[PDB]
Amino acid sequence: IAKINLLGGQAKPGPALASVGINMGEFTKQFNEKTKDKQGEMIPCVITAYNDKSFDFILKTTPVSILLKQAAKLEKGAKNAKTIVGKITMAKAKEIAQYKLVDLNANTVEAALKMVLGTAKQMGIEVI
Amino acid sequence: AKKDKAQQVADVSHLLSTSAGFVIFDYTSMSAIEATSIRKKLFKNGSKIKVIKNNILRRALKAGKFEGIDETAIKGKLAVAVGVNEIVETLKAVDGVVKAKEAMNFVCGYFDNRAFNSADLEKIA
Amino acid sequence: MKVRASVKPICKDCKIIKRHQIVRVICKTQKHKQRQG
Amino acid sequence: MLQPKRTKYRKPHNVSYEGKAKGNSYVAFGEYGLVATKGNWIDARAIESARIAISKCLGKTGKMWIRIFPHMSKTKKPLEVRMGSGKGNPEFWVAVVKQGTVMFEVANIPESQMIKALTRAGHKLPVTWKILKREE
Amino acid sequence: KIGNRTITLDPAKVNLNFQKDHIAVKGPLGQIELKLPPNLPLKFELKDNNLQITRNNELKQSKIFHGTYNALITNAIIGVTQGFEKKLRLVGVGYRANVEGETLNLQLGYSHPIKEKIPKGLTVKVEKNTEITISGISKELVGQFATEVRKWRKPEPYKGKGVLYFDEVIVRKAGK
RNA sequence: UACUAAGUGGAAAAGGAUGUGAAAGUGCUAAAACAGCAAGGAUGUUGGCUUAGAAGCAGCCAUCGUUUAAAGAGUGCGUAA
RNA sequence: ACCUCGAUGUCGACUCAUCUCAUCCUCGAGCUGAAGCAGGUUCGAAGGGUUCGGCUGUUCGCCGAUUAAAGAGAUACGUG
Numbered sequence: 001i002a003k004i005n006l007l008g009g010q011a012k013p014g015p016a017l018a019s020v021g022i023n024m025g026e027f028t029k030q031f032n033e034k035t036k037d038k039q040g041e042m043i044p045c046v047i048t049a050y051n052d053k054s055f056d057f058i059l060k061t062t063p064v065s066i067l068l069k070q071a072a073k074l075e076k077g078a079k080n081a082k083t084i085v086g087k088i089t090m091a092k093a094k095e096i097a098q099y100k101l102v103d104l105n106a107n108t109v110e111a112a113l114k115m116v117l118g119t120a121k122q123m124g125i126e127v128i
Numbered sequence: 129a130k131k132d133k134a135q136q137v138a139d140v141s142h143l144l145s146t147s148a149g150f151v152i153f154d155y156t157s158m159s160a161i162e163a164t165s166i167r168k169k170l171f172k173n174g175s176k177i178k179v180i181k182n183n184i185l186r187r188a189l190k191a192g193k194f195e196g197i198d199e200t201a202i203k204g205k206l207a208v209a210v211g212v213n214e215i216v217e218t219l220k221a222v223d224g225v226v227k228a229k230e231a232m233n234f235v236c237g238y239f240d241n242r243a244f245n246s247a248d249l250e251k252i253a
Numbered sequence: 254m255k256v257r258a259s260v261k262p263i264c265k266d267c268k269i270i271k272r273h274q275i276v277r278v279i280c281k282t283q284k285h286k287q288r289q290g
Numbered sequence: 291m292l293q294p295k296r297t298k299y300r301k302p303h304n305v306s307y308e309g310k311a312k313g314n315s316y317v318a319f320g321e322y323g324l325v326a327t328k329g330n331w332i333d334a335r336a337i338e339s340a341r342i343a344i345s346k347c348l349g350k351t352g353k354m355w356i357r358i359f360p361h362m363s364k365t366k367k368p369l370e371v372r373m374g375s376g377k378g379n380p381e382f383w384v385a386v387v388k389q390g391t392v393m394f395e396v397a398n399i400p401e402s403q404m405i406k407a408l409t410r411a412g413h414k415l416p417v418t419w420k421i422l423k424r425e426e
Numbered sequence: 427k428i429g430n431r432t433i434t435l436d437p438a439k440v441n442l443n444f445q446k447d448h449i450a451v452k453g454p455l456g457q458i459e460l461k462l463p464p465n466l467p468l469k470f471e472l473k474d475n476n477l478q479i480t481r482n483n484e485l486k487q488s489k490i491f492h493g494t495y496n497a498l499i500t501n502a503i504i505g506v507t508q509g510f511e512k513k514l515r516l517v518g519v520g521y522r523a524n525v526e527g528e529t530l531n532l533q534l535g536y537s538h539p540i541k542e543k544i545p546k547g548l549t550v551k552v553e554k555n556t557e558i559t560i561s562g563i564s565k566e567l568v569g570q571f572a573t574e575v576r577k578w579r580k581p582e583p584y585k586g587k588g589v590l591y592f593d594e595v596i597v598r599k600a601g602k
Numbered sequence: 603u604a605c606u607a608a609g610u611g612g613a614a615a616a617g618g619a620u621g622u623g624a625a626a627g628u629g630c631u632a633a634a635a636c637a638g639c640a641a642g643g644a645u646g647u648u649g650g651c652u653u654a655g656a657a658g659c660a661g662c663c664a665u666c667g668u669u670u671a672a673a674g675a676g677u678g679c680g681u682a683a
Numbered sequence: 684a685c686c687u688c689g690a691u692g693u694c695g696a697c698u699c700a701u702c703u704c705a706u707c708c709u710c711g712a713g714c715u716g717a718a719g720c721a722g723g724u725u726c727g728a729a730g731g732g733u734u735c736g737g738c739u740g741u742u743c744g745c746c747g748a749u750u751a752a753a754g755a756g757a758u759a760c761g762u763g
């Protein structure tokens with residue numbers, strides 16, 4: 001099993017999965033298929049390795065906390081947590097948590113909120 | 129404390145007194161994702177899957193007035209699945225969960241006040 | 254081998270034994286052997 | 291280097307430390323203190339080494355109080371000279387430390403860290419040290 | 427503790443007879459003799475398909491013996507019923523091993539010829555030219571001969587070459 | 603009547619140490635203790651500074667929530683990532 | 684400033700060596716920022732060996748060419 005952050009719009013120049021016995025030419029078309037709904041983003045993909053050289057892949061969301069910068073309206077958070085540079089409404093956090101649901105292993109939407117609350121505090125952002 | 133242990137036994141004993149299924153499973157070869165995946169498949173909030181130490185299980189079953197159920201929890205790692213109402217689906221869920229995974233044991237248990245064996249799990253599933 | 258007046262463990266697994274009335278230390282990393290007290 | 295700015299009489303009598311610690315018997319400012327179990331003379335240089343050890347290992351959070359001070363001077367005759375014909379010049383200052391004087395003491399930093407700081411300190415001093423804690 | 431451990435002497439072919447200063451343990455593979463020293467403070471009593479032994483007192487050396495003879499009895503029993511073996515991977519370039527009569531001979535980087543006499547009760551086998559399998563009845567002799575083979579060319583970290591014991595992860599030092 | 607295993611006794615320190623004895627309390631203990639043995643030891647995360655290459659591990663800035671019996675922006679090892 | 688002044692001859696060399704180990708070589712072993720060669724350091728070891736020359740009253744030394752190496756010390760700074 002080797003995870004990699006293959007870009008969603010491009011898949012063709014490369015060899016570190018070739019030592020796994022992966023047939024690169026047959027899977028490059030598949031990477032550009034389902035990912036075409038979210039072009040221009042770097043999508044992480046899990047790669048299981050079956051003995052028979054069969055393979056099944058699982059795409060994931062764009063990395064957490066990147067979205068928090070957008071909701072805050074500020075390009076970068078504080079280097080010091082005590083310095084409350086930004087503030088975000090709890091309703092806006094609901095919009096963010098829903099996007100991450102496929103990646104998040106959180107049991108409930110209410111718990112999914114709590115998981116994002118520990119990420120908002122890393123940026124020093126107030127939860128209002 | 130003695131009081132804390134008694135409360136845990138009493139709570140478990142009371143739960144086993146209203147259950148429609150108690151099924152004993154070895155917790156061997158169960159990953160953290162598998163622990164969350166099996167619980168998630170058990171979807172409907174009427175069932176629980178928990179790794180429980182044998183000494184608690186034994187006292188709880190003993191005070192719930194169960195018998196011959198000692199063999200399921202005798203000398204083995206013992207997670208428990210206990211569901212409510214339509215209990216048959218829970219057994220099929222755990223039976224297809226092992227089969228999907230590398231392995232897992234399915235020792236047996238009690239279905240609607242009736243003892244079943246390991247071999248009878250497939251029949252129910 | 255390190256010969257020192259005071260021998261104390263340097264790693265997590267550097268155990269201390271007493272062999273032939275002499276206190277010594279053993280680690281899986283052979284740089285940590287000590288002797289003579 | 292700790293040193294009295296100026297003293298009255300430059301060449302005084304040596305003070306024997308064979309006692310049981312007139313004054314400074316107990317820790318008085320911090321939670322832990324370093325006690326001696328054999329009286330001695332520790333000069334300004336040794337106080338400096340101990341102070342810098344405690345400061346280096348203390349981090350930028352806590353505080354260290356030095357209780358003793360090299361009040362007394364001390365002389366040393368120049369080398370390859372016959373005896374008599376005067377008293378030699380003063381060379382180095384020294385703090386008399388009787389048995390059982392809480393000389394160093396620390397504050398406002400975790401327990402184990404303070405114990406380690408004190409152990410790192412007492413290895414510079416000649417006196418066989420010991421660890422004491424504030425009463426209550 | 428190992429002093430208070432219940433030995434299960436299976437009554438298949440293993441019989442145990444205690445003399446004053448010797449223990450004789452016999453089984454399917456080969457009789458074994460244990461030479462106990464006098465003033466032994468342990469009381470060895472055996473049952474049918476079970477064995478329990480106790481010390482008279484709480485003296486330190488007695489507490490040591492209480493465990494160590496239990497261990498030796500268990501190892502002698504398991505050896506005389508199943509037998510021990512050690513397994514040596516002779517790894518290298520021009521290295522090889524083989525047997526000739528009673529003498530195991532070896533070729534290593536040595537310009538000197540290497541031969542070695544096997545003691546009684548130990549049988550080596552060279553199933554592949556880079557493998558040695560030493561089979562014995564008591565752990566002590568098989569281990570002794572394993573190390574007598576190993577002393578000739580110990581492993582190195584720069585390259586793994588050596589008389590490596592099977593499944594031992596020698597550390598790696600990379601030189602350039 | 604106990605203590606000593608060192609020929610201490612029959613030279614000596616700062617300092618180091620599962621040597622052994624005595625006493626004092628404190629904590630778990632047959633609703634199973636300690637060690638060992640059989641399982642698992644996760645997601646956010648590839649947070650970001652940035653290094654052709656540092657994404658749990660060259661170092662550096664906050665250094666926490668979430669799935670559960672359990673989980674360290676990871677105990678340390680070991681990767682040009 | 685304790686024996687020695689009604690005398691205990693003092694530097695260096697020569698001859699003869701003797702002893703200690705805190706070892707220069709020879710010997711055995713560990714760790715390595717030890718690939719090999721050659722090393723750096725530590726442990727044990729005192730059986731044996733441990734140069735010739737220029738200058739200098741020389742010890743000491745600087746220098747040349749060797750050697751496996753050209754030890755540190757003690758013995759009234761050994762030895763009239």
Ligand SMILES: [K+]
Nearest residue numbers: 687688690691
């Ligand atoms: K004279």
Ligand SMILES: [Mg+2]
Nearest residue numbers: 692697762763
């Ligand atoms: Mg004459």
Ligand SMILES: [Zn+2]
Nearest residue numbers: 264267280285
């Ligand atoms: Zn270590």
